[PDB]
Amino acid sequence: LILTRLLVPPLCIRPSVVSDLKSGTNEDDLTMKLTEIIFLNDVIKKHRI
Amino acid sequence: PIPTVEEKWRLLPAFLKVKGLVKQHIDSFNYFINVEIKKIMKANEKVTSDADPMWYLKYLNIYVGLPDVEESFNVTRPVSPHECRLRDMTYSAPITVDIEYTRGSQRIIRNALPIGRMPIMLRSSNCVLTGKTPAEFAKLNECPLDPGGYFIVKGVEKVILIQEQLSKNRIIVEADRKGAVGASVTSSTHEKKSRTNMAVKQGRFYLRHNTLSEDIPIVIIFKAMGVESDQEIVQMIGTEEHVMAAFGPSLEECQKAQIFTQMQALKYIGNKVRRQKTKIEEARELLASTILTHVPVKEFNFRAKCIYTAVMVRRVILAQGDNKVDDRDYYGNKRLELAGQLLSLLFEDLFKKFNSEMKKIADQVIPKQRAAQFDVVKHMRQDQITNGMVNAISTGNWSLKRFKMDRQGVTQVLSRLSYISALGMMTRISSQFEKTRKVSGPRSLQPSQWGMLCPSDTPEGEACGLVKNLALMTHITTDMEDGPIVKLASNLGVEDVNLLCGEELSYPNVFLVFLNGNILGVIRDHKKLVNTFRLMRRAGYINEFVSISTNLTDRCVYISSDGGRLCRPYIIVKKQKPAVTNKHMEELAQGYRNFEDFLHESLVEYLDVNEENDCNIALYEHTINKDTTHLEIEPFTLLGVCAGLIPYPHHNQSPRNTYQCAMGKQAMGTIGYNQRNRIDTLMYLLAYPQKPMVKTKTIELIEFEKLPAGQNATVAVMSYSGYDIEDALVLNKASLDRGFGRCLVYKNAKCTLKRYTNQTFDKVMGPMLDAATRKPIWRHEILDADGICSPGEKVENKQVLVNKSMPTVQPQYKDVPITYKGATDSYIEKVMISSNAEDAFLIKMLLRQTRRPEIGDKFSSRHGQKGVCGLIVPQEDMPFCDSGICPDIIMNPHGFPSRMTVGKLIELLAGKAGVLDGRFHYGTAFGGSKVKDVCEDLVRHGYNYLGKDYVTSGITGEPLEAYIYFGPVYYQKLKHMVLDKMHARARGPRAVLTRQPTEGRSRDGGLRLGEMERDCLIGYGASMLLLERLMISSDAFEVDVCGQCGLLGYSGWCHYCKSSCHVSSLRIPYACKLLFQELQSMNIIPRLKLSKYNE
Amino acid sequence: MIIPVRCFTCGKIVGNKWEAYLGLLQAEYTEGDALDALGLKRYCCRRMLLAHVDLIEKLLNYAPLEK
DNA sequence: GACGAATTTGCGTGTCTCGACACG
RNA sequence: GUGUC
Ligand SMILES: [Zn+2]
Ligand SMILES: [Zn+2]
């Protein structure tokens, strides 16, 4: 009932947006939240030492 | 018989020449860039740093220039609106300020310091399009009939819609789910929006404001304000037998709690108050300038505030026990908001931001300096102001948290479909409520509005009253000051409220004076006050836009001078008779004695909604009675701009009137005088526009006879073979071939191309030749040797217009050839090549397509009767009557009774009589022409008198037993042709997220099958077709899972068991498998159990 | 924009009398006088000249002219 | 006379609140 | 967001 291991979903379920505007990519909000929570996973391991 | 002056119809044109319809949109902006722009400069006048009190800057004077553009290098030349409309530029002028700053030790006064730009209206005072002549209007390539009033930002016309809001600085008393409650909203010039409310429960009054934790008794607030003795408290509340039985309980529960001194009440409040300096000072300053800031306090005196709260409590008590309640549907309280004060708030917030952050630009440099003097004009910036202005105008996100406000959908692109849709959008008004089903009062037509908002003018659909339009004769009042008003009121003999106690205000003879929600004092015999104020207003000393009213149920006189009120002129009468005579209007017809001196001679005057509450107005001059005070000039000014095109509106029904005023802006026609030069996205034009025979005076007021959007055609009201069912109409093939109803569509295709931060670029190769013969390839056929298409050519389906080759990131180039997509075969009109403000080449192309009316096109009758065309009939049919005149459009007599439209037959009769005689007949509302003098004129020629003629059927060759109704009618062609409303798809592109047809026709998508149509298939009981067109034709996928543990495998292989023994497959829609793969990441694993279909 | 060459209902040539109708409206003639003197007798081929706007005249002031 | 147990009632919070098509 | 049913 307690989450300690997060399951990364497949990559085909979160398509990436491409722009004919700026040679630009746009990620899914799930991917951005994953990259934001992984940065929180490394900031705690640095502070203990 | 009574003396009647049949001349007052020329007052209205002279009044609209001064102001009115759209001139107020320019008045609000011309007054803002001349009065408020310097008030804001004086507000934020001195700003200094805190490092050392030696550096400071001062604001002397600020002003704006004329519309100018900054090109390559110090190039400021006067630009015209058309140039900005074609170059995708923005119409703006710089704001040059003369400030002074002290660097080192000496003071520097740099004159003409530019700080930013600001958009300028098309017909404003600073623009070039003012005071010109039509010959000079044609020199700048601009339509002289263009009313203007919009903003040009990035080559689009943006207009700010007027928005209505509730009145501030006032007391409301409304009933809610349990009982009655009074409320007060306070918001002055300074940003302080407060909402206090007093509620009643268990016979106990409680004051609620979001700054306090919970309720505070009113007697506690009184004792904290300064009134200590409980006797004068009830004295101020009211000395009556029934008001004491309701005020005793609160007094005794106040006596229960041990609070008898000011310090006790202050400590009690401070303990109650929560905020994220002692408690006594906290409660003192919280009662000082937090609750009610619209009532200023001189030193620390809470007396005006406590008398205000006492009269509020008295109004609540008198509301209690009765059914007297205040509603929000009254328009005398509702105020309007133009684009002026919105721009004011935006500009003051941007200016405060620019002053406060630049204060921090030189705050990190003074200690960490390198020399003795600091220059600030090099520590200066001019992009935030322009960026903010353009963003707020184009984007439409009015977000000011300094003002605690977020508003969306304020600016909209100007409708350029027709000439009526452009002007009718300028008078469109938006409401503050959002588009919801709960509303029924505000959507309902209120009796309050009379001659201010058009009743018929409203879109039919979801919003059925949230969007309203202004009337012909009305004016929006701007804001003023109250100095001389208060001075004259004090000299008239009004009393100071600080001298008399609470007992005298309960006296019935005593009347209270209210000025913009502020108690001035007590006045006796208010009739003399009102009379003298009205006489002084008619004199000329006080400005004419000051309202005064009196209410006897609460015995209070209101003096309203706030901006944003509705004003329309009324003719004054004196005891039996209108002051305006024939000799006064003969001079107006001569050329002197205009509207302003008419107002200066005390002959007409403005009245508001609340001031006409206590006044009697006469409709005509035969209904004038002995108590009538004012006379309405004309009764046909009640109709709006879109409702002024309907012949005999009183003859027609209100649903038909609404349908017609809604369809009048969708009718296609000519746009203006320069339609060949302007290049808009989509343009609909007509070939040969005719002139309406039965015209209206409103048509002449707007000069619609120069740009009509319809054609006159012969109509025969009779049933035909089979194709005039409910709304179908029959056309004449010969007339369509002759050219009745020829339309033209103009589409825009623009392409910009720029450079990058590196030395990469774009290029246009051009046409492609082959090796057999020297011909352009089929792909690039229309392309010129330059690389673009030349005008005067014919482009077919999926052909290249312009070659666009851009690098991937010596370099490899990917070609992006712009391809024209269309079922039709378009034609090229012209090609424009220019440069924008950011040094990029822009190529625009205008594509023309001529279309003819066919089966499936929507037409209207300008009387709320719309229909698609039925059968196209040749000329051998369509019987002539005697002379050989054939019906151009067959009308069905079966849609007349239910729709209940009588003005159509009258308009037909008048048009026939006019085309026979040779003069246009007037068909204005509440007048025009009758059916008694016109029918006797139709006899002189030789025709029948009302409508009938002898017809000879053509398909048989026999006469018709009954007679048929023939006559010319003004018809109009609308949009939504069957050529564009036609789609079909079998196998096209799919989405990447889910394998399903995409949305829209521009991407060649399919149709949606919702649940309501699924219920019809379920009620029948068919299961094969329900599964065939939801799983077989939409998304059929073959997945595989395992029997040991239900999970999604791959390639007949599991990663959980690592064995392919227990592996099977099934058919599932891709949506369900996607949902399973999405839920498995939510700690929800759908363990599946397979089985044989035989099992 | 321009006067139609033929009528819409019957098909009578009405495009050869526009300039004559204009020149006859300046000789102190009534609209009906000009209309029944030109030759129009019925009303289906009479509102082509009576109710007609001239926008090509205003469209030539914005037309490209040579310098 | 004084303490544990069960009843009725004012008050706190979450969810939506019909369909379809076309254009920028 | 606008327009129609
Ligand atoms: Zn398995
Ligand atoms: Zn004819």
For the residues of B959-978, what is the DSSP string, one character each?
B-SS-EEEEEEEEEE-S--T
| Per-residue H/E/C for B871-904 | EEECCCCCCCCCCCCCCCEEECCCCHHHHCCCHH
Inter-chain touch C62–B138, beta carbons under 8 Å? yes
Residues in chain C within 8 Å Cβ distance of B138: 61-62
Q: Tell me, in Å, how far CA of B203 is from C1' of D11?
A: 20
- Please choose, from the candidates B310, B299, B319, the residue with its C-alpha nearest in 3D space to the C-alpha of residue B497: B310
Give partners of B (≥3 CB pairs < 8 A): A, C
Residue C47: alpha-carbon gap to chain centroid: 9
Task: State which amino acid sits at residue B231.
Answer: Q
**Cα(B8)–Cα(B580) distance, rounded to whole angstroms?**
9
Number of neighbours of residue B28 by Cβ within 10 angstroms: 22
Which residues lie across from B470 on neighbouring strands?
B453
Binding residues of B for Zn(2+), by number, are 1042, 1045, 1054, 1057
The residues near C64 (Cβ < 8 Å, ≥ 6 apart) are none
Closest ligand to residue B1087's CA: 1
- Please choose, from the candidates B710, B715, B722, B712, the residue with its C-alpha nearest in 3D space to the C-alpha of residue B890: B715
Q: Select the residue of B993, B1081, B1083 nearest A15 (Cβ to Cβ).
A: B993
B1013 touches strand D (CB under 7 A): no
**Cα(B743)–Cα(B524) distance, rounded to whole angstroms?**
71
Which residues lie across from B1066 on neighbouring strands?
B1039
The two beta strands, B1037-1041 and B1064-1068, are: antiparallel
C-alpha angle B300-B304-B308 in degrees, rounded to nearest 5: 135
In this complex, is the C-beta atom of B852 within 8 Å of any C-beta atom belonging to chain C? no
Give partners of A (≥3 CB pairs < 8 A): B
Q: Which residue is nearest to nucleotide E4 (CA to C1')?
A: B976
Q: Which residue of B has its CA nearest to C47?
A: B915
Q: Which of A13, A28, A37 to mutate against chain B (most B CBs within 10 Å)?
A: A13
Query: Nearest CA of chain C to the CA of B703: how many Å?
Result: 12
Q: Which residue is nearest to nucleotide E5 (CA to C1')?
A: B461
The residues near B742 (Cβ < 8 Å, ≥ 6 apart) are B686, B687, B688, B850, B851, B852
B999 touches strand D (CB under 7 A): yes
In this complex, is the C-beta atom of C12 within 8 Å of any C-beta atom belonging to chain B? no
Residues in chain B within 8 Å Cβ distance of A13: 1074, 1077-1078
B412 touches strand E (CB under 7 A): yes
Q: Tell me, in Å, how far CA of B983 is from C1' of D22?
A: 11
Catalytic annotation on B176?
Answer: no
Query: Nearest CA of chain A to the CA of B785: how many Å?
Result: 27
Binding residues of B for DNA, by number, are 177, 406, 1001-1002, 1008
Residue B76: alpha-carbon gap to chain centroid: 35
Q: Quick one: resolution in A? A: 2.9
Token pair listed for B511: 């009347």
Range of the domain at C21: 1-67
Query: Nearest CA of chain B to the CA of A16: how many Å?
Result: 9
Q: Select the residue of B690, B740, B916 nearest C51 (Cβ to Cβ).
A: B690
In B166-233 the beta strands, taken as DSSP E runs, fall at 170-175, 180-186, 194-201, 204-208, 216-217
With an 8 Å Cβ cutoff, the interface of chain A facing chain B consists of 3, 7-10, 13, 15, 20, 23
B666 touches strand E (CB under 7 A): yes
Inter-chain touch B1074–A13, beta carbons under 8 Å? yes
Q: Tell me, in Å, how far CA of B177 is from C1' of D15?
A: 21
Q: Select the residue of B809, B992, B1080 nearest A23 (Cβ to Cβ).
A: B809
Is chain B touching chain C, with at least 3 CB–CB pairs below 8 Å?
yes
Query: Nearest CA of chain B to the CA of A8: how many Å?
Result: 7
Residue B58's Cβ-count burial label (10 Å; 0-12, 13-18, 19+) is middle
- Please choose, from the candidates B534, B536, B535, B509, the residue with its C-alpha nearest in 3D space to the C-alpha of residue B522: B509
**Cα(B728)–Cα(B731) distance, rounded to whole angstroms?**
10
- Please choose, from the candidates B332, B334, B336, B338, the residue with its C-alpha nearest in 3D space to the C-alpha of residue B23: B338
Q: Kindly report the length of chain C.
A: 67
Q: Select the residue of C6, C43, C53 nearest B708 (Cβ to Cβ).
A: C53
**Cα(B17)–Cα(B11) distance, rounded to whole angstroms?**
10
The CA distances from residue B1073 to B317, B989, B1014, in Å, are 66, 21, 22
Q: Of B98, B727, B917, B1004, which residue is the catalytic one?
A: B727
Query: Nearest CA of chain C to the CA of B293: how many Å?
Result: 59
Token pair listed for B473: 């004769």
Phi, psi of B171 (to 5 degrees): -110, 130
Bases along strand E below 7 A from a protein CB: 1-5
Q: Select the residue of B809, B992, B1077 nearest A9 (Cβ to Cβ).
A: B1077
b/e per residue B698-714 (b: at least 16 CB within 10 A): bbebbebebbbbbbbbb
Q: HSE-up of B791 (CA within 13 Å, CB side)?
A: 11
**Cα(B269)–Cα(B280) distance, rounded to whole angstroms?**
8
B1001 touches strand D (CB under 7 A): yes
Q: HSE-up of B483 (CA within 13 Å, CB side)?
A: 1
The two beta strands, B556-560 and B519-523, are: unpaired
B983 touches strand D (CB under 7 A): yes
Q: Which of B993, B994, B1079 to mutate against chain A (most A CBs within 10 Å)?
A: B993
The two beta strands, B866-873 and B729-732, are: parallel
Q: Tell me, in Å, how far CA of B156 is from C1' of D2?
A: 85
**Cα(B60)–Cα(B97) distance, rounded to whole angstroms?**
8
Which technique was used to obtain these atomic coordinates? cryo-EM
Inter-chain touch B676–C4, beta carbons under 8 Å? no
Token pair listed for B487: 């001075």
B459 touches strand E (CB under 7 A): yes
Task: State which amino acid sits at residue A49.
Answer: I
Q: Which nucleotide is nearest to B980 (CA to C1')?
A: D22
b/e per residue B785-814 (b: at least 16 CB within 10 A): eebbbeeeeebeeebbbbbbebbeeeeeee
**For chain C, how many structural domains are there in total?**
1
Max Cα-Cα span within chain A: 46
H or E segment to which residue B558 belongs: strand B556-560
Which sign, positive or negative, has the C-alpha torsion B452, B455, B456, B458?
Answer: positive
Residues 413-452 in B having a C-beta less than 7 A from any atom of strand D are: 437
User: Coil, strand, or helix at residue B605?
Assistant: strand
Q: Which nucleotide is nearest to B866 (CA to C1')?
A: E4
Distance B885 CA to ligand 2 centre (A): 8
| Per-residue H/E/C for B278-297 | CHHHHHHHHHHHCCCCCCCC
H or E segment to which residue B422 belongs: helix B419-426
Residue A45's Cβ-count burial label (10 Å; 0-12, 13-18, 19+) is exposed
Residue B401's Cβ-count burial label (10 Å; 0-12, 13-18, 19+) is exposed
